[PDB]
């Protein structure tokens, strides 16, 4: 009813400003003062590859319904998301923007935006969470294609057409932009490395994976080609509405946040579709370090419950590696999953092993006889080869979750192994540095065991424990076992 350029942003953002002298970060866990300083239609740099500019699209691409859910979003960030969609998308391709107000404190945050051309607002009468909110919006959608965006995004130049083009050609493709970064402190818009894609460790927490050298070379081979990915980097994506419905929408028993990216990614791939990152599509996102809202039930309980529902439906026996990483999750009730199991059966989906082999072969799987596996953690540091080889010392280094020099297993033979190298007690005198040496089956100097509720690592047949107190002076040592912070070590997976 007002065209977006005529929407009064100053009146809208005005009453909800951070008070003079008060904390810019409190409400949103990003700097709202900096968000509020920006125009709703602020220019952002074109981060697309130059080759993206040489593309033309048919006018008959399918229109989309854009579903944005929010709970206590900053007005300036919510408005700028909406305006970026309206400004940067050919209007015929925007059937509607459905804002799902997930029981925000002030209903006017959403209601006032309903006066803008294309924008319709649905308000939940209680907190429903992003999964159920997204389903409500998708159910209300008139278009043939769904687009989901977070409520603190900024769409870039020709972001939409490349996504719609993929899905129009094959409805089983679920497609995402490259996600650019809107800095949570100063709101600068910048690009990250396009050699990163979505992934996860066995704790089922999303992380960014660095592409392999061959994947990177392929990417330089065609920097505009769609990139297959094992895991949607949540939750900015485009999906054919009928395919969304046919595949089972979202699991309605998932709450708040977390797990749903895992669940839909497993379901899409195992059940015959694909996930892509589309480099010529760029959307900025305000990444933050803490959630600004509460999780009814507890953020730890909610995340575990959602994640268990995904694991129990999709992962087959590999769910046991999740429980090895997160043993506390075995205690968290997750509710009835029969409707999802029936869905899996109806759709004739492949086993999780097929997903690992064909979609995410980069995820390292433990050996069937390993005792423990993954990273060996002390605080925020990890056991690390430091790039050393046989005869070299080992150290601690900030955990990066990228595997590599931080990949270990405690083997059936009780060795602590990286590739062909094993932690070796070359000198049993307390205070001595340990060394990497080639693994040898019956070498007593290479045998270790978890002790004290899997919180320390003792050299078998001794009273010597692994100790980082020597890290400054040259590497990790064996030391008389004692009640020392520097002797705490825990494998990420205990099998």
């Amino acid at each position: 009813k007002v065209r977006w350029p005529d929407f009064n942003q100053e009146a809208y953002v005005g009453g909800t400003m951070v008070r003079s002298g008060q904390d810019p970060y409190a409400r949103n866990k990003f700097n709202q003062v900096e968000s509020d300083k920006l125009r709703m239609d602020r220019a952002i740099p074109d981060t697309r590859h130059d080759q993206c500019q040489r593309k033309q699209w048919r006018v008959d691409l399918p229109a989309t319904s854009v579903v944005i859910t929010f709970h206590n979003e900053a007005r300036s960030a919510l408005l700028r998301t909406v305006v970026s969609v309206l400004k940067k998308s050919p209007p015929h391709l925007i059937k509607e923007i459905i804002l799902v107000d997930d029981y925000s404190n002030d209903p006017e945050d959403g209601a006032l935006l309903g006066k803008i051309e294309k924008v319709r607002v649905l308000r939940n009468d209680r907190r429903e969470g992003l999964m159920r909110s997204r389903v409500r919006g998708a159910d209300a959608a008139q278009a043939k294609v769904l687009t989901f965006l977070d409520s603190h995004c900024e769409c870039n130049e020709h972001w939409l057409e490349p996504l719609l083009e993929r899905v129009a050609e094959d409805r089983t493709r679920v497609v995402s932009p490259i996600i650019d970064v809107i800095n949570m402190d100063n709101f600068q818009y910048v690009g990250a490395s396009a050699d990163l894609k979505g992934g996860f460790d066995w704790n089922l927490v999303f992380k960014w994976d660095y592409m392999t050298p061959e994947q990177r070379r392929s990417r330089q081979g065609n920097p505009v080609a769609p990139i297959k990915t094992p895991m949607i980097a949540g939750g900015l994506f485009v999906m054919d509405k009928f395919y969304f419905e046919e595949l089972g929408k979202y699991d309605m028993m998932m709450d708040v946040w977390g797990g749903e990216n895992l669940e839909i990614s497993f379901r899409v791939w195992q059940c015959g579709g694909s996930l892509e990152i589309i480099p010529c599509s760029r959307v900025g996102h305000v990444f933050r370090k803490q959630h600004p809202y509460t999780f009814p039930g507890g953020s730890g309980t909610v995340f575990a419950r959602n994640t268990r529902r995904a694991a129990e439906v999709w992962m087959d026996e590999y769910k046991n590696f999740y429980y090895a990483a997160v043993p506390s999750a075995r205690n968290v009730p997750y509710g009835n999953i029969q409707s999802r199991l029936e869905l899996r059966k109806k759709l004739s989906c492949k086993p999780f092993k097929w997903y690992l082999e064909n979609v995410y072969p980069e995820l390292r799987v433990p050996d069937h006889q390993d005792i423990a596996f993954g990273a060996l953690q002390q605080g925020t540091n990890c056991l690390d080869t430091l790039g050393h080889f046989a005869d070299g010392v080992v150290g601690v280094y900030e955990c990066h979750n990228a595997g590599g020099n931080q990949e270990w297993a405690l083997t059936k033979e009780k060795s602590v192994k990286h590739m062909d190298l094993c932690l070796t007690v070359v000198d049993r005198a307390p205070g001595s540095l340990i060394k990497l040496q080639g693994c040898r089956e019956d070498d007593s100097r290479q045998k270790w065991e978890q002790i004290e509720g899997n919180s320390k690592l003792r050299h078998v047949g001794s009273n010597l424990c692994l100790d980082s107190r020597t890290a400054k002076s040259g590497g990790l040592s064996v030391e008389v076992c004692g009640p020392a912070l520097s002797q705490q070590w825990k494998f990420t997976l205990n099998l």
């Binding site: 999303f206 992380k207 960014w208 980097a233 990444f287 370090k289 803490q290 790039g387 990228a402 590599g404």
Partner: peptide, 14 residues
């Protein structure tokens, strides 16, 4: 429970 992380990775190579 931490939100979606900014896209980064290790600053060294294995």
């Amino acid at each position: 429970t931490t939100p979606s992380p900014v896209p980064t990775t290790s600053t060294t190579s294995a």
